Write a protein that binds this ligand. Structure first.
Ligand SMILES: COc1ccc([C@H]2N[C@H](C(=O)O)Cc3c2[nH]c2ccccc32)cc1CN1CCN(c2ccccc2F)CC1
Ligand SMILES: COc1ccc([C@H]2N[C@H](C(=O)O)Cc3c2[nH]c2ccccc32)cc1CN1CCN(c2ccccc2F)CC1
Ligand SMILES: CCCCCCCCCCCCCCCC(=O)O
Ligand SMILES: CCCCCCCCCCCCCCCC(=O)O
Ligand SMILES: [Ca+2]
Ligand SMILES: [Ca+2]
Ligand SMILES: [Ca+2]
Ligand SMILES: [Ca+2]
Ligand SMILES: [Ca+2]
Ligand SMILES: [Ca+2]
Ligand SMILES: [Ca+2]
Ligand SMILES: [Ca+2]
Ligand SMILES: [Ca+2]
Ligand SMILES: [Ca+2]
Ligand SMILES: [Ca+2]
Ligand SMILES: [Ca+2]
Ligand SMILES: [Ca+2]
Ligand SMILES: [Ca+2]
Lengths: 649, 649
């Protein structure tokens, strides 16, 4: 099943779909080289599952500080998740590690042996593998850097995280220098403030002076402690504030902003680099296909040679036109010349143009079946009235749900009937899922993102129903009222309003695209939390806990547990009342060096990654602006002054 | 002193300097129409003083709540500034109002009577004047909206604030709609969270439910109360956090960012509008001058006609070249044609080109004096070695100062000698001021910004010396160690490092340019504070003060006084622990409507003006990037494909 022309057409569709591989030749459908990656996909879904669960091993992982004394699994030094036993832990560690290993050495399948070993990615991946396994054996017989290779093996296990990392690296160098200037602002400012308030009342806050005045000026840099840090000085003199305002201003509006400007520039650049490299890589496939078609090597393809290529592209991928004797006729009209030679570089541009205009990916097959009985249903499902029907069923679902919930707030028993109706609503959706997938096929249905999401939500509902009914309100209310979110697609309605089209459109294109960078910033938290659990086992818990933190101890109710540490790290990441974690923990250890963690976290994530995501969101929104602006034709683009099309048919 | 050609040349220099006036003709230097605005400048400096002091009347203004009972000018309901008496207040109110009035009706001088009255600006300005005066009389005989016209009269008293306001207005419309979408996010989110936690423990925080759950979700939108707001829920269930993270995320990284994106777009647009209009206005002057030169009206200027114009431009404004018989020769070389006709539109482009290249503003005169004795000094001052000498004197000043201060921190009496030396240092600077101004002239010296700043700082030092010595350490230490800032120009040194050139250059171009927008956001605070003093006279002060605020009462140590209210408003503007002011004051009045102030302040300044200043800083930095990039030639720009210069001489 490997037509000669056919190899080429499909490959064109790979260029447009943009799939990535780098194998220079497959000897005679798949052929020897393709079949490996070809069967890698099925393993790729399960692989997905394996890296997610493998990765979640760390939260359910049992803590290291509990293994010694004293009170075992008490609420003292508080925790909240299931934890895990090493007997129950190791079976899973070994399953994840074995399956993982299969996955890591599967590439040699489609790669040269010495090629797989020589590649830096495979050597590093396999290295983390080796560390993981050695530590799993050691663990079996009887634990410090075992999780780190969990998150590190995970970060490069998925490409989209990987290339995001790479994007960071390029802007990292410049980021460091700008950090140097920032640090000179902090040093100098701390100095002048401290010297200003040495013989004054704020000697108590400046008691440690520059070592501490630098600390306080640093937190004031965040504004997290704005009124509180200089309140003794302000009490001493109303004019003292004139400094801090002056200091806060410059710190926040002048410095902290153009920092972001730096990150915006570096990021924008690196993204240009990344998409351009992406373009060379896609063109690699395109030129590959063409080169296959061009047997003679002259660098051009005959009319008779390219006609077939259009035939299998038109039939196989996209709906363009119908070949004819008049085929030849069209060739005569364009130039009234008779060579019929299209270049290697020209053919690619042709195919991309076919992608934007002629392209529109036809269904794959799906049967050994008859079209009649289903055939009724199919045309009726694709009808617009059908979509109207689902719209109205979700509107009627919204009113239904509002009523059920409001009945819970009212507490009347009348909430029960409507709630059962909500379950019936759920069924409609499963039907919609089953019919829709039956009507378009699984591959098309999965092509659109909203349908993938819908599918998965629906299935959360179904498993919720089996569990809920086999298992026997709060048992059901909580589980099913949330999934009202499947009514969320109704928001695309607002795009019809001209004002809100850029906001909702940018938000919807933003929900997936922001995901690589959000995951990037999330792993950072995983590593940081592995660090935290190791370094802060306690909390002097009994005198030092109450002295360290009051209101904050209400906040410092966490960081002795990995989930605890994840949510606490979130609190730091949003930067709300963050310093209480920094100062309190500082005196739980007693050494200022502890604070480095927190100043290491700030710079890496608050001054780098979050600023980055700002740049990403603004850049995406602006792209949207230019797109909608382009749809109403303007900013006319040709090759320099004008294009040499020479008139149409 | 009004040469016919000369009127035109100088006007060209107005185009390049960009001064603004709109008078269509001055009948036969100044002439009838120019002389008015011409003598407006001297009055413009004093006017400056008058709007600043007039404006500062509000802080020194005596409060309205103290006028009734009870305890008069106690520390109870605390205050800290001088306040003012109505006998001492009214003399100044009337002086400011009279001088101001002279200023407001001075334009008819250069304007048509019905023209001045018809202009919207003059009618509004004069209207605020009339309100001010009426209230000053009423005040004399014996107070609510009198200050508002102080800040409003001030905002349009200076152009740069005015056009910034105008810039805001254009983006204001769109800003409102985006605010609508934001408000639907707040409403919907508050709903779903509240329904989620109605039958749960966080019923106490959700006790008032949507009225209050909307409030809490709103503050969580700011992250100002992140850990604290949902701590009871998190205590009830660790999984509760899964909501807030999900909520916080979307609120901060998705929504709050693209809000800024909106402000960035609207602002960038409005700035394009403003600078383009600026360009039409400048070209108005250019075309005016040319039209004057072109007596025949054909629309072009003869060689003999334009030669004179170049002669008085070269002599009067900038150093270009020397006219010759070969003058004619150059004309023959360009085109080997003999018409010598340059168009109205062409002449303008010519003049702008002369600005960038040939232009370089020669000293104005300054004498009835002899050049000999000063003439030594002058060439020596302009020498580069002289600047090196000041550089080294400021370096030696930095070490000197570090030593004095460190002696204060050490507390040794040895701090005294060095400190006296610092005073001698100050004198060097006054010399540098006096010599420099003598060597370049006051107008050139004032042309460069660093020299204006230096001048003023130096003078703070001199008045400090007269006051300090006539008046008799802390008396001197505080007053003179600060002015070490005149050593701050040493930072331009870092621009020599390639990395830091964009940061320091963007920061230095940013210090003045950010000033219009900072002033804009500052007046907002003046109005808001006039509102605050009126609406919050008390603080039930005695039970309600201690109940309302603890730590916060340490923060709610203010807002009963105008200066107090200004610094407190600053604390809100930086958004650090802001909600304590909102909630506490809310129960000092007891009505939720109070909170509107604080939600009115947030949206107007935190979601609009500050986001704006972000846009401004990033945009400025990017402009810098493109400028330095342009200096190393790239991105070659011509009129479309190529320019028709036709070769040089
Ligand atoms: C490296 O050790 C120094 C060099 C200079 C200073 C400043 N102290 C001087 C003083 O006592 O007055 C004035 C001055 C300083 N820095 C300046 C820069 C320019 C001009 C004046 C100064 C402080 C230090 C000590 N610092 C260095 C940084 N430290 C530190 C660094 C990383 C993590 C945690 C930390 F605590 C804390 C202690
Ligand atoms: C105008 O009065 C309303 C309309 C709708 C609601 C929400 N309450 C509903 C409920 O009780 O469950 C659900 C729901 C709401 N809003 C929605 C939007 C879409 C879908 C569901 C909802 C609340 C209110 C009352 N709100 C309106 C706004 N209020 C307010 C406005 C400005 C300043 C100060 C304020 F306190 C506070 C009280
Ligand atoms: C580079 C200049 C920065 C300084 C900014 C000026 C701030 C004004 C300082 C006034 C504080 C007076 C302190 C007196 C304390 C007291 O009276 O006990
Ligand atoms: C649109 C979906 C939003 C919902 C996000 C999911 C958050 C998980 C909710 C779990 C909270 C469980 C509350 C139980 C309280 C208790 O046990 O007393
Ligand atoms: Ca295939
Ligand atoms: Ca283990
Ligand atoms: Ca001391
Ligand atoms: Ca002192
Ligand atoms: Ca060929
Ligand atoms: Ca033709
Ligand atoms: Ca917490
Ligand atoms: Ca003049
Ligand atoms: Ca008054
Ligand atoms: Ca209730
Ligand atoms: Ca319930
Ligand atoms: Ca003429
Ligand atoms: Ca020539
Ligand atoms: Ca305060």
């Amino acid at each position: 099943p490997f037509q000669k022309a056919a190899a080429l057409v499909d490959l064109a569709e790979d260029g447009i779909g943009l799939p990535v591989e780098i194998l220079d030749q497959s000897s005679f459908s798949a052929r020897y080289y393709f079949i490996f990656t070809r069967l890698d996909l099925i393993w790729s879904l399960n692989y997905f599952a394996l890296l997610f669960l493998n990765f979640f091993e760390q939260p359910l992982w049992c803590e290291k500080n509990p293994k010694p004394s004293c009170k075992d699994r008490d609420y003292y030094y508080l925790g909240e998740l299931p934890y895990l036993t090493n007997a129950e832990s190791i079976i899973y560690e070994v399953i994840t590690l074995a399956i993982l290993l299969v996955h890591t050495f599967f590439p040699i399948s489609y790669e040269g042996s010495r090629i797989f070993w020589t590649s830096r990615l495979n050597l590093v991946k396999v290295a983390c593998v080796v560390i993981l396994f050695v530590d799993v054996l050691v663990d079996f017989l009887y634990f410090r850097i075992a999780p780190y290779v969990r998150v590190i093996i995970f970060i490069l296990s998925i490409r989209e995280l990987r290339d995001t990392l790479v994007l960071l690296s390029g802007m990292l160098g410049t980021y460091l220098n700008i950090l140097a200037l920032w640090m000179l602002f902090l040093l100098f400012a701390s100095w002048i403030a401290f010297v200003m308030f040495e013989d004054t009342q704020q000697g108590l806050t400046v008691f440690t002076s520059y070592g501490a005045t630098l600390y306080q000026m640093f937190i004031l840099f965040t504004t997290s402690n704005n009124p509180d840090v200089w309140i003794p000085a302000y009490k001493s003199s109303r004019w003292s504030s004139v400094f801090f305002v002056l200091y806060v201003l410059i710190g926040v509006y002048f410095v902290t902003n153009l920092i972001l400007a730096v990150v915006y520039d570096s990021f924008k650049e690196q993204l240009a680099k990344q998409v351009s490299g992406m373009d060379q890589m896609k063109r690699r496939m395109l030129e590959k296909a063409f080169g296959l078609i061009d047997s003679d090597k002259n660098g051009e393809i005959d009319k008779n040679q390219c006609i077939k290529l259009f035939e299998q592209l038109t039939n196989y991928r996209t709906l363009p036109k119908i070949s004819k004797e008049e085929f030849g006729l069209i060739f005569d009209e364009l130039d009234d010349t008779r060579d019929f030679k299209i270049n290697k570089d020209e053919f690619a541009d042709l195919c991309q143009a076919i992608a934007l205009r002629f392209q529109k990916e036809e269904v794959p097959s799906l049967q050994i079946y008859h079209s009649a009985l289903s055939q009724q249903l199919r045309a009726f499902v694709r009808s617009p009235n059908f979509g109207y029907a689902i719209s109205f069923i979700l509107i009627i679902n919204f009113i239904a749900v509002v009523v059920e919930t409001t009945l819970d707030i009212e507490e009347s028993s009348a909430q029960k009937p409507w709630q059962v109706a909500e379950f019936v609503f759920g069924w409609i959706y499963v039907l919609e899922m089953a019919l829709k997938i039956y009507t378009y096929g699984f591959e098309n249905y999965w092509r659109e993102g909203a349908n993938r999401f819908d599918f998965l939500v629906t299935w959360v509902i179904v498993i919720g129903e089996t569990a809920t009914f086999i298992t026997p309100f709060s048992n059901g209310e909580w589980i099913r009222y949330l999934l009202l979110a499947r009514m969320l697609r109704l928001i695309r309605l607002l795009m019809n309003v001209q004002r809100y089209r850029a906001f909702i459109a940018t938000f919807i294109t933003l929900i997936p695209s922001l995901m690589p960078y959000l995951g990037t910033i999330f792993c950072v938290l995983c590593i940081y939390c592995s660090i935290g659990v190791q370094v802060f086992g306690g909390l002097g818990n009994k005198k030092l806990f109450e002295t360290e933190l009051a209101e904050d101890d209400y906040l410092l109710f966490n960081f002795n547990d990995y989930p605890n540490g994840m949510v606490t790290l979130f609190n730091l990441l949003v930067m709300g009342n963050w310093q209480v974690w920094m100062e309190s923990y500082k005196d739980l250890t007693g050494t200022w060096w502890s604070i480095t963690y927190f100043v290491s976290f700030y710079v890496i994530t608050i001054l780098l990654l979050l600023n980055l995501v700002v740049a990403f969101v603004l850049e995406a929104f602006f792209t949207e602006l230019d797109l909608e602006e382009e749809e109403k034709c303007q900013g006319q683009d040709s090759q320099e002054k004008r294009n040499r099309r020479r008139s149409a048919g």
